Design a protein around this ligand. Structure first.
Ligand SMILES: [K+]
Ligand SMILES: [K+]
Lengths: 165, 168
């Protein structure tokens, strides 16, 4: 069972400026509170392969993903390659829509399922399948909100600060 | 103070078809399961005032909203002119964005506060303000999700029927 979630927020910054914020993955470490570290492993026109260090209920976790960036639509399609230990699949999109000249509807979606139990009955040697399912939802819920708000806050900081006065 | 929430769903239908489902409030009692009855009190170019019977939690709530419809903007601004007893204010927007030719991002916002405590310290002579708050978050959260999904199910249903080759 693949789960689909979407969250949104309204940002008082133009879409082009929100896009600049989304596109700058290395800046995620400075603005995303649960994001410790970001490495660009590979990169070219229209894509970034990235390794992430992020916490998943109280501790630092690692995974890799491909980002495909569509500046004209202002969509970033992400997909995990090497998955978090309780993650079987994880992908989704950041979308910045134009609401008017100065405001953006910002969307982040998640398509995800937990890793299957191993031969010991547990997911990643620790969790019951039911407990891994509920921890993955709680983590997506929590980081979705914190991520959307971190982007909004940084876009509005640049309008106030970086623009003026 | 006033609360503000936003929920969204991606509709596998074009934005114009989603607009059509949003704009036709006469269809809302068919398309929204908790909606029992809709009634048009006032209607003109760009606006509808509408009386609604909607079950929330236990039961049947009645309210009246002014819908300002803006098809070019793909936005319906709503403000409730008569509300349920625990509700002091209730307004928001539907917003449909073209994602591509076949898909639409669908958004529903709520701006809301509980009714002000009366001289007894209760809201509608029945609830502490904390109780009323707590109950209104639950009900906005629940119905917001149900409404978004009603609209999506309906628009996608209509894509099937317009793409329908006849059978037995
Ligand atoms: K950080
Ligand atoms: K109904």
């Amino acid at each position: 069972h693949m789960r689909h979630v979407e969250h949104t927020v309204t940002v008082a910054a133009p879409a082009d400026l929100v896009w600049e914020v989304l596109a700058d993955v290395l800046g995620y470490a400075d603005i995303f509170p649960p994001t410790e570290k970001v490495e660009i492993l590979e990169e070219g026109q229209g894509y970034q392969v990235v390794r992430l260090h992020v916490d998943v209920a109280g501790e630092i976790n690692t995974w890799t993903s491909r980002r495909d960036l569509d500046p004209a639509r202002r969509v970033i399609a992400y997909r995990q390659l090497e998955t978090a230990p309780i993650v079987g699949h994880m992908s989704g999109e950041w979308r910045a829509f134009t609401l008017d000249a100065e405001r953006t509807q910002l969307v982040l979606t998640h398509d995800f399922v937990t890793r299957a139990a191993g031969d010991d009955g547990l997911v990643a040697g620790k969790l019951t399948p039911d407990e891994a399912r509920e921890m993955l939802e709680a983590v997506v819920e929590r980081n979705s909100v914190a991520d959307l708000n971190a982007v909004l806050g940084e876009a509005e900081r640049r309008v106030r600060a970086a623009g003026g006065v």
